[PDB]
Amino acid sequence: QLKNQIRDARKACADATLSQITNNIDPVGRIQMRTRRTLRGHLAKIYAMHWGTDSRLLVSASQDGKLIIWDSYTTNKVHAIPLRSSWVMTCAYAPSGNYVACGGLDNICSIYNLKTREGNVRVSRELAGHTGYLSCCRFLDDNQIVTSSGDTTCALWDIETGQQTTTFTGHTGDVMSLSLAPDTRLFVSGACDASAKLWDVREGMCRQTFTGHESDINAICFFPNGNAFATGSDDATCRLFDLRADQELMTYSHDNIICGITSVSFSKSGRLLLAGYDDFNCNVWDALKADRAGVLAGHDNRVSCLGVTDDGMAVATGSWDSFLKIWN
Amino acid sequence: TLSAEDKAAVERSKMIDRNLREDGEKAAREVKLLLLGAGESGKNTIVKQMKITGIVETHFTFKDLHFKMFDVGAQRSERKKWIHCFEGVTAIIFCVALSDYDLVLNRMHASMKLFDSICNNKWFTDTSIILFLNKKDLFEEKIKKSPLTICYPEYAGSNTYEEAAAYIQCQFEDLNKRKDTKEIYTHFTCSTDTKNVQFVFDAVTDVIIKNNLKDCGLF
Amino acid sequence: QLKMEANIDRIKVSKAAADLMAYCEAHAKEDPLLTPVPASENPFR
Amino acid sequence: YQVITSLLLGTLIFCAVLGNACVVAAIALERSLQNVANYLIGSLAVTDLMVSVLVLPMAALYQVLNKWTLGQVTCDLFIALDVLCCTSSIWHLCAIALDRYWAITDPIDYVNKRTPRRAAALISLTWLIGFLISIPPMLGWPDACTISKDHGYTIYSTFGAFYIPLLLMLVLYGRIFRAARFRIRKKNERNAEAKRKMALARERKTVKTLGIIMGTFILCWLPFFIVALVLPFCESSCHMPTLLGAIINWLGYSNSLLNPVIYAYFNKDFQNAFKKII
Ligand SMILES: C/C=C\C/C=C\C/C=C/C/C=C/CCCC(=O)O[C@H](COC(=O)CCCCCCCCCCCCC)COP(=O)(O)O[C@H]1[C@H](O)[C@@H](O)[C@H](OP(=O)(O)O)[C@@H](O)[C@H]1O
Ligand SMILES: O=C1CCc2ccc(OCCCCN3CCN(c4cccc(Cl)c4Cl)CC3)cc2N1
Ligand SMILES: CC(C)CCC[C@@H](C)[C@H]1CC[C@H]2[C@@H]3CC=C4C[C@@H](O)CC[C@]4(C)[C@H]3CC[C@]12C
Ligand SMILES: CC(C)CCC[C@@H](C)[C@H]1CC[C@H]2[C@@H]3CC=C4C[C@@H](O)CC[C@]4(C)[C@H]3CC[C@]12C
Numbered sequence: 065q066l067k068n069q070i071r072d073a074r075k076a077c078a079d080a081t082l083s084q085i086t087n088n089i090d091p092v093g094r095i096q097m098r099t100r101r102t103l104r105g106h107l108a109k110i111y112a113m114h115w116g117t118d119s120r121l122l123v124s125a126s127q128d129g130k131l132i133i134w135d136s137y138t139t140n141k142v143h144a145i146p147l148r149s150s151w152v153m154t155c156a157y158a159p160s161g162n163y164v165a166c167g168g169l170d171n172i173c174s175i176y177n178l179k180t181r182e183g184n185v186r187v188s189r190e191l192a193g194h195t196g197y198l199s200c201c202r203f204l205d206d207n208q209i210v211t212s213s214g215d216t217t218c219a220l221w222d223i224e225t226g227q228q229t230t231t232f233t234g235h236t237g238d239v240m241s242l243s244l245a246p247d248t249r250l251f252v253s254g255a256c257d258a259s260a261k262l263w264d265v266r267e268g269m270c271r272q273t274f275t276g277h278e279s280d281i282n283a284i285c286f287f288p289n290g291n292a293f294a295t296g297s298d299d300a301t302c303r304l305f306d307l308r309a310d311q312e313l314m315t316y317s318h319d320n321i322i323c324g325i326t327s328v329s330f331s332k333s334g335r336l337l338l339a340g341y342d343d344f345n346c347n348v349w350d351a352l353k354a355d356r357a358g359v360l361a362g363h364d365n366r367v368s369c370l371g372v373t374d375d376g377m378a379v380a381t382g383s384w385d386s387f388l389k390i391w392n
Numbered sequence: 393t394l395s396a397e398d399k400a401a402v403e404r405s406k407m408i409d410r411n412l413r414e415d416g417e418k419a420a421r422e423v424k425l426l427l428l429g430a431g432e433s434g435k436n437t438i439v440k441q442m443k444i445t446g447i448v449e450t451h452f453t454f455k456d457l458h459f460k461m462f463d464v465g466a467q468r469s470e471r472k473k474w475i476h477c478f479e480g481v482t483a484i485i486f487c488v489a490l491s492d493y494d495l496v497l498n499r500m501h502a503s504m505k506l507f508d509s510i511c512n513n514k515w516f517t518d519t520s521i522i523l524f525l526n527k528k529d530l531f532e533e534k535i536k537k538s539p540l541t542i543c544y545p546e547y548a549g550s551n552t553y554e555e556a557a558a559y560i561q562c563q564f565e566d567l568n569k570r571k572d573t574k575e576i577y578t579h580f581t582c583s584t585d586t587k588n589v590q591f592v593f594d595a596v597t598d599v600i601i602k603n604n605l606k607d608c609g610l611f
Numbered sequence: 612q613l614k615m616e617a618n619i620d621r622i623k624v625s626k627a628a629a630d631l632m633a634y635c636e637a638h639a640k641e642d643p644l645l646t647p648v649p650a651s652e653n654p655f656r
Numbered sequence: 657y658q659v660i661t662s663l664l665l666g667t668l669i670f671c672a673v674l675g676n677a678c679v680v681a682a683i684a685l686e687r688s689l690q691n692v693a694n695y696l697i698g699s700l701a702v703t704d705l706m707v708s709v710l711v712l713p714m715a716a717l718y719q720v721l722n723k724w725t726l727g728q729v730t731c732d733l734f735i736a737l738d739v740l741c742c743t744s745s746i747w748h749l750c751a752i753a754l755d756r757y758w759a760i761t762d763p764i765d766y767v768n769k770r771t772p773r774r775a776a777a778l779i780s781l782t783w784l785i786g787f788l789i790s791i792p793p794m795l796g797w798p799d800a801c802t803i804s805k806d807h808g809y810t811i812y813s814t815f816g817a818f819y820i821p822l823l824l825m826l827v828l829y830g831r832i833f834r835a836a837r838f839r840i841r842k843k844n845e846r847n848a849e850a851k852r853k854m855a856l857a858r859e860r861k862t863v864k865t866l867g868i869i870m871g872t873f874i875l876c877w878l879p880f881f882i883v884a885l886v887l888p889f890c891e892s893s894c895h896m897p898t899l900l901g902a903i904i905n906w907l908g909y910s911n912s913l914l915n916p917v918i919y920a921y922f923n924k925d926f927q928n929a930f931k932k933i934i
């Protein structure tokens with residue numbers, strides 16, 4: 065009854081879709097991009113990456129067990145951290161840049177300190193307690209961190225104490241994605257249940273639920289305005305859900321594309337969206353016209369991660385071929 | 393052209409790259425194995441035999457060859473979301489408990505289903521599988537009490553171990569649909585600890601030799 | 612859990628779409644990806 | 657008449673250069689093709705490219721004009737370059753056979769002690785043998801110019817350039833064939849029949865590959881070396897025709913372009929890389 069009531073409420077407010085209003089909006093056209101920098105050095109497939117707030121330094125995690133930080137301006141490797149576990153699938157970069165978190169199949173995503181009196185990297189904190197593989201743990205502040213695990217639960221931990229301050233439960237399937245809003249007050253999550261959940265950090269109870277996907281959700285990313293987000297699944301369709309309308313706006317799909325998706329990102333203005341498909345390619349779609357606007361080739365294996373800088377100067381895409389390509 | 397700070401950063405990056413290359417070259421000289429099977433198949437027994445909260449890594453050396461074995465059974469989750477990380481392993485050691493043929497989790501059926509799922513996975517098309525059958529003595533003691541028909545209604549035969557073990561091995565080896573690409577090795581675990589290690593070493597050597605022959609175009 | 616989810620404010624999607632367009636056009640002039648940037652100020656050159 | 661021969665020689669040289677350059681570029685640019693096994697193939701391709709662009713055109717010009725019009729010192733340089741390049745190309749086959757035998761028969765060494773330094777050492781050894789064979793005739797010492805016909809020098813060149821590497825290659829490939837056979841041989845009736853059929857197919861494929869590899873090299877090089885060994889020892893029977901000599905020489909030179917086809921164009925990963933390029 066309650067679910068039927070919610071469905072009726074969300075359906076009754078849909079008479080005009082944004083896609084038809086976007087017809088009057090002029091198309092963005094073809095955005096031709098070329099590889100500006102080619103970061104190399106990984107000897108195994110990479111699984112995740114993050115962009116710094118200064119839009120100059122980036123960090124990546126790969127299967128060989130090395131966490132590498134590159135200076136995108138000069139390609140030089142700044143820091144290389146040897147990891148205890150080589151099965152890492154995620155990494156994160158603190159907004160202040162003092163700490164770096166990384167994890168994987170092991171139930172701990174360790175946080176390392178980059179600012180030490182000895183001038184060398186060292187382990188700062190190990191967050192044990194999860195009973196499943198950690199999909200991704202993202203920094204919330206210099207002392208708080210949000211972690212998404214494969215045990216269908218999320219956890220907010222205090223770095224100084226090492227104990228999870230908050231626990232989020234309710235997902236039936238394992239949560240494979242997690243994105244943080246610019247306000248750092250509420251976050252979206254995506255699981256294999258073909259649905260997404262909007263949570264808020266402070267009170268720690270379920271704020272909203274979105275559905276519509278037909279397969280496991282692998283990627284998620286907040287809209288720059290913070291009132292919307294995008295999700296991707298194995299159904300080769302990108303779905304944009306906004307927190308205030310509580311309904312789907314458009315579906316990005318094409319006949320040519322049939323493989324799944326791995327990463328979703330937004331530009332600085334949010335006009336265009338970037339997706340990384342398993343067919344060793346990236347697709348740049350228009351977030352408004354819902355049509356394809358660009359194709360980024362140049363990867364010899366499945367694309368695993370990609371990310372835009374804070375200032376939007378360039379976008380760096382990684383893949384299983386152990387090479388990172390910077391496009392502007 | 394380049395300032396002092398830029399030059400120092402260039403040398404630091406070069407040193408880091410050289411160290412990373414050396415570490416990768418050192419790590420590339422190890423044979424990686426992936427362990428799979430049901431929890432009640434006596435995995436720990438063979439683990440402690442060869443070795444003497446998620447991924448369990450076991451490192452051991454034998455006849456100048458180093459083996460790193462990754463056990464994933466310690467955690468339960470969706471297999472199709474992290475198994476691709478194990479692509480490229482030299483071999484998959486599968487564990488099966490014969491004595492669980494008449495235990496309802498049906499345990500033998502679940503083991504066969506898991507073996508079918510793993511063997512025919514697209515990520516392990518070229519990955520060899522080494523099958524181990526654990527607890528043969530207790531199976532011999534149990535088979536004197538119940539026939540094979542409690543688990544295999546469509547099977548008729550004698551209740552002798554020499555035939556029952558062969559039938560189980562044939563049934564397990566008949567599940568693969570890519571016999572040309574991959575071969576399955578079956579061994580019976582015994583009290584002698586060195587026998588399992590020798591069988592694993594022989595299987596790994598055979599797999600390496602077959603891969604080399606395929607690369608040379610002979611096999 | 613679902614009992615209290617329905618007790619939220621419900622508005623029209625047209626104003627949300629208008630807000631999305633307004634946010635998109637407001638920052639369109641400050642998007643390096645949207646409009647190609649020359650080498651005069653491009654740091655990746 | 658000379659026009660047809662010149663055109664055919666130019667076409668052969670052009671095809672050889674194209675093949676060698678394509679193999680070299682594909683090996684150099686690709687990342688998945690950088691390994692110890694492929695380094696020897698790359699060195700062989702570079703050597704054959706050097707033969708095609710440095711030795712083949714001048715020999716073709718000599719054949720077309722039927723006489724040397726470039727000078728005695730030019731002929732000496734041509735002989736030195738041709739001997740060195742041919743010896744290096746021949747010894748590349750022996751080095752590749754030795755590497756394959758070591759990899760197949762010693763898996764522990766393949767896993768642990770196999771490094772590109774081994775391939776570099778093999779290439780350096782082949783070049784050293786080529787130099788030690790090419791230097792002595794000039795170190796110790798008009799319209800038609802030929803290699804010195806000293807019996808001792810001829811015996812040394814033939815033995816250290818073709819016969820010894822041929823014997824080593826034959827022994828290594830026989831051991832490889834024995835090992836491959838040992839590995840291959842080592843309701844249910846249908847499964848047994850399928851296993852026997854697969855074993856027979858693998859045996860046939862191995863036999864075909866070994867036969868092709870041996871026969872190409874044999875037909876390319878053996879008759880020329882037999883002729884070069886027999887001619888100086890019988891001055892009273894040097895009535896052999898020029899046509900047969902030209903045919904033998906060009907058949908021997910065709911090994912330079914035939915080697916990449918057998919060793920590079922027949923690999924599944926190499927043609928996959930070629931398709932990736934297009
Ligand atoms: C007894 C009765 C009578 C019978 C006896 C007499 C007649 C006998 C004839 C028997 C046939 C002989 C030739 C066999 C041809 C053949 O079978 O090839 C088939 C089609 O592929 C191509 O042809 C690919 C060919 C394309 C190669 C490129 C050519 C064009 C390049 C031009 C160069 C210049 C370009 C710029 C199938 O291919 P294949 O099974 O033969 O391929 C194998 C290859 O032969 C092995 O050598 C190779 O081993 P390796 O190279 O040594 O490492 C194996 O890995 C495998 O690749
Ligand atoms: O009357 C004619 C007509 C036709 C003609 C065409 C070309 C020509 O160029 C000379 C090239 C010879 C072939 N080289 C000889 C050197 N050779 C080698 C290499 C290592 C060891 C050893 Cl022992 C040897 Cl021989 C490799 C193959 C001369 C003539 N003469
Ligand atoms: C310069 C070029 C034209 C020389 C080419 C020679 C080739 C085509 C000839 C020479 C000797 C021949 C091989 C001799 C021996 C065998 C072994 C047999 O079990 C299968 C065929 C096979 C493999 C023959 C196939 C074709 C063969 C390889
Ligand atoms: C088929 C390919 C791959 C290998 C074999 C090439 C053979 C068949 C071809 C290539 C070049 C040809 C030779 C080119 C030049 C001459 C010199 C002339 O005065 C007589 C014929 C002769 C000797 C030709 C005969 C046949 C030849 C040797």
Ligand SMILES: CC(C)CCC[C@@H](C)[C@H]1CC[C@H]2[C@@H]3CC=C4C[C@@H](O)CC[C@]4(C)[C@H]3CC[C@]12C
Binds near residue numbers: 678931
């Ligand atoms: C300038 C460029 C286009 C030169 C192209 C050269 C390469 C790419 C060409 C020349 C001959 C071609 C090959 C000839 C024979 C075969 C065997 C067939 O069963 C699969 C394709 C394959 C393997 C072809 C693929 C591409 C190929 C290797």
